[PDB]
Amino acid sequence: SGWTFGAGPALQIPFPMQMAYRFNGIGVTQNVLYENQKLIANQFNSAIG
Amino acid sequence: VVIGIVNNTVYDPLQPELD
Ligand SMILES: *[C@@H]1O[C@H](CO)[C@@H](O)[C@H](O)[C@H]1NC(C)=O
Numbered sequence: 001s002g003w004t005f006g007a008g009p010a011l012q013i014p015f016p017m018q019m020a021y022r023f024n025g026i027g028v029t030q031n032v033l034y035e036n037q038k039l040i041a042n043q044f045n046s047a048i049g
Numbered sequence: 050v051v052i053g054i055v056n057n058t059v060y061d062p063l064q065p066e067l068d
């Protein structure tokens with residue numbers, strides 16, 4: 001759900017679109033995430049590992 | 050490179066006014 005579960009009814013939303021929202025919230029455009037999605041996913045997996 | 054994008058058409062607010 002993202003952040004909608006803590007401010008009212010839960011709203012379904014894909015995780016990449018939530019990441020795009022979170023990147024746009026700080027000023028970074030969503031193009032760098034919608035294009036270089038595999039690199040961000042690999043970096044996140046490496047960090048979690 | 051975008052994964053999950055679909056094909057659709059967008060509107061132009063200048064073509065009908067010019068043509
Ligand atoms: C969306 O999810 C379905 C089910 O997991 C999958 O078959 C489909 O390939 C996914 N869409 C994309 C663009 O990967």
Ligand SMILES: *[C@@H]1O[C@H](CO)[C@@H](O)[C@H](O)[C@H]1NC(C)=O
Binds near residue numbers: 055056
């Ligand atoms: C969208 O268009 C591209 C090129 O015209 C094509 O390769 C692709 O298969 C199309 N996708 C769909 C879902 O029609």
